[PDB]
Amino acid sequence: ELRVGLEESELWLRFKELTNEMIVTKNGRRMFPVLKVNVSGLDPNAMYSFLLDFVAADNHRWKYVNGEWVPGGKPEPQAPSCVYIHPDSPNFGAHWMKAPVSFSKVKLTNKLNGGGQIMLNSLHKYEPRIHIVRVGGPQRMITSHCFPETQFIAVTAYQNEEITALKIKYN
Numbered sequence: 001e002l003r004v005g006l007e008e009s010e011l012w013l014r015f016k017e018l019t020n021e022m023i024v025t026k027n028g029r030r031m032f033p034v035l036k037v038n039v040s041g042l043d044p045n046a047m048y049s050f051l052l053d054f055v056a057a058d059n060h061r062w063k064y065v066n067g068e069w070v071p072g073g074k075p076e077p078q079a080p081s082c083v084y085i086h087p088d089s090p091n092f093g094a095h096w097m098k099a100p101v102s103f104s105k106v107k108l109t110n111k112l113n114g115g116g117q118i119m120l121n122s123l124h125k126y127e128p129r130i131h132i133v134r135v136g137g138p139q140r141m142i143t144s145h146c147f148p149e150t151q152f153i154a155v156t157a158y159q160n161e162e163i164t165a166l167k168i169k170y171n
């Protein structure tokens with residue numbers, strides 16, 4: 001049985017208890033904290049690619065109103081996010097298992113781009129998700145895993161100064 005763990009769950013949970021926020025820019029902004037995943041149970045000799053996407057956790061626009069995030073009442077279906085390929089992809093199971101898989105180079109944007117950067121909708125809530133794709137082998141296989149601890153609202157600037165303080169304290 002293939003095992004997937006969040007590294008530094010302690011810290012992510014401090015952000016989640018405040019409602020996490022991630023900056024989006026036209027050119028793309030790197031995440032803090034960085035999603036780092038512990039993986040065991042891969043075939044050391046098999047080939048895998050690590051993919052990252054962002055599920056829209058609900059169909060609502062969120063607004064920071066008198067110091068609290070509150071959802072709107074005009075839900076729209078959410079067009080699914082594009083996939084980011086970990087730049088170490090494709091690689092042997094042994095490569096992926098020798099240290100946490102760190103998505104330090106994904107950039108979150110609010111504008112459709114030349115590629116690389118992942119476009120999110122500002123003021124929408126997202127749940128990071130990975131896909132571990134066994135490639136090249138006879139049988140293709142996909143194992144997917146969500147990280148509720150890493151949920152955030154995409155923002156063009158921080159609304160909650162308690163998030164601003166935590167981002168600086170731990171970066």
Ligand SMILES: Cc1nn(Cc2c(C)noc2C)c(=O)s1
Nearest residue numbers: 067157158159160161162164165
């Ligand atoms: C409401 C509040 N807004 N701010 C401004 C602010 C600073 C400074 N950094 O992030 C934010 C957000 C407070 O300090 S209470």
